[PDB]
Each structure stands twice: as structure tokens, then as C-alpha cells.
DNA sequence: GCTATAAACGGGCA
DNA sequence: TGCCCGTTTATAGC
């Protein structure tokens, strides 16, 4: 599955779930010692839990965004704990349309990269302006994934809805990275 | 921390 | 409309 012998580590998962019931955000902010609520700044109650370590953004619509988990399973579990906390605050919340929205991964190929040469040979997919950001932004089309490539050989892979896309994008880029290994 | 990346969410504003 | 508003996370030069 990983011909490269390297498996990108999952670092952050963004998911959403529909609690399916309108929410009184001021009421949640009061009853919960866990919550943070600043309406003029953002229309959401910000809640956090230690295990799995995540941050939830809860809206009046009943929609909820779960961030920070290390896996899809962890992200769903976390979203479930938030749903229960809300149910317990006195809201008839369900757990409708749970959906993984973004998976962020990273790995180390353990060799330096000639970013400029790589960008020049893949102009249609590359954005490299070292004065603004030290990483080369590689917008792959298949799968539709963005990789941030650094001189150190460290790689960030983001935009995936399924972990296999994270893996395929890395496998696709591996031989390109090797071709432009800084010697 | 600022710079940049992806994604979801909502209120506010030109 | 189409932005930024928020939060998360790896990464690194400023």
C-alpha cells in the first residue's frame, strides 16, 4: 500500500455532525464550564475535551465542527462526547450526517529537496515563493490534494476526505521528491 | 507569534 | 456575492 516504505502520520481531522435541533448558545455557555462564547467575534460556542484531545465549534443551527483528532475514529468518538454533553445540557440532540471533511498528515522522506528545481519542472502544480512562505505548495490534481514541501524533506499533505487519498498523494510525489533530492 | 495549506461552520459587511 | 470571522495540525523562515 506504501511502496515507498513510508506511511504519512495522521495529524488532524476535521469532521462535522448535525445535532438536528436548534441550540441556545448563551444557555450552553452558562451551564458549561467547558465552553467559550464570544458572539461578536464568532457565532459559536467553543468547547474542548481531553480525550480524544479535540476542539468543537457548536452553532445555534445545531451544526457542529470537530477538530484536532488524530484519526477518523477518534474524531467520531469526540463528536459523540460533544453530542452527549449537549444532550445533557437539556437539548434533544441526535447525531445526523457525521462526515469527515479534512484529513491532515505529514511525513519525513529524510533527505533534502531542491524546491526551485521541483517547482520549475512542475510549474502547473507548484507555487514556490520562499520570501512569503518557505514551503513549496504543490496542488496535485489526482487525487485533489495539496502538499507543502520543505527543503528539509518534511511534507504536509492536506485536503483529503479519505486517508487513502493522503497515502496516494504521497506515493505519487515520492518519485518526484527523489528526482529532486538536494545533493 | 507572523507568513501559507485544507476543510467545515456563521454573522457581518461592502 | 465573496470575503473574513473561528479552530485544528503538521511544516519553517521571519
UniProtKB/Swiss-Prot annotation:
Swiss-Prot/TrEMBL Sequence repeat ranges: 10-86, 100-177
InterPro entries noted in UniProt: TBP (IPR000814), TBP_CS (IPR030491), TBP_dom_sf (IPR012295), TBP_eukaryotic (IPR033710)
MF terms in GO: DNA binding
Primary location: nucleus
An example Gene Ontology CC term for this record: nucleus
Compartment(s) of residence: Nucleus
Complex formation: Belongs to the TFIID complex together with the TBP-associated factors (TAFs). Binds DNA as monomer. Interacts with TAF1 (via N-terminus). Interacts with MEE12/CCG1. Associates with PWP2 in the nucleus. Component of a nuclear protein complex containing at least TATA binding proteins (TBPs, e.g. TBP1 and TBP2) and ATX1.
Function, in words: General transcription factor that functions at the core of the DNA-binding multiprotein factor TFIID. Binding of TFIID to the TATA box is the initial transcriptional step of the pre-initiation complex (PIC), playing a role in the activation of eukaryotic genes transcribed by RNA polymerase II.
Similarity comment: family membership: Belongs to the TBP family.
Protein name: TATA-box-binding protein 1
Organism in which the protein naturally occurs: Arabidopsis thaliana
Amino acid at each position: 500500500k506504501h511502496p515507498s516504505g513510508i506511511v504519512p502520520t495522521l495529524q488532524n481531522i476535521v469532521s462535522t455532525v448535525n445535532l438536528d435541533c436548534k441550540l441556545d448558545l448563551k444557555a450552553i455557555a452558562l451551564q458549561a464550564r467547558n465552553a467559550e462564547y464570544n458572539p461578536k467575534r464568532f457565532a459559536a460556542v467553543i468547547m474542548r475535551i481531553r480525550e480524544p484531545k479535540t476542539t468543537a465549534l457548536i452553532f445555534a443551527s445545531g451544526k457542529m465542527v470537530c477538530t484536532g483528532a488524530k484519526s477518523e475514529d477518534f474524531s467520531k468518538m469526540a463528536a459523540r462526547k460533544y453530542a452527549r454533553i449537549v444532550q445533557k445540557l437539556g437539548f434533544p440532540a441526535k447525531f445526523k450526517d457525521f462526515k469527515i471533511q479534512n484529513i491532515v498528515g505529514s511525513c519525513d522522506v529524510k533527505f533534502p529537496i531542491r524546491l526551485e528545481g521541483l517547482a520549475y519542472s512542475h510549474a502547473a502544480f507548484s507555487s514556490y515563493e520562499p520570501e512569503l512562505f518557505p514551503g513549496l505548495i504543490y496542488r496535485m490534481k489526482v487525487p485533489k490534494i495539496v502538499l507543502l514541501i520543505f527543503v528539509s524533506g518534511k511534507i504536509v499533505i492536506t485536503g483529503a476526505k479519505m486517508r487513502d487519498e493522503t497515502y496516494k498523494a504521497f506515493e505519487n510525489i515520492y518519485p518526484v521528491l527523489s528526482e529532486f533530492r538536494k545533493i
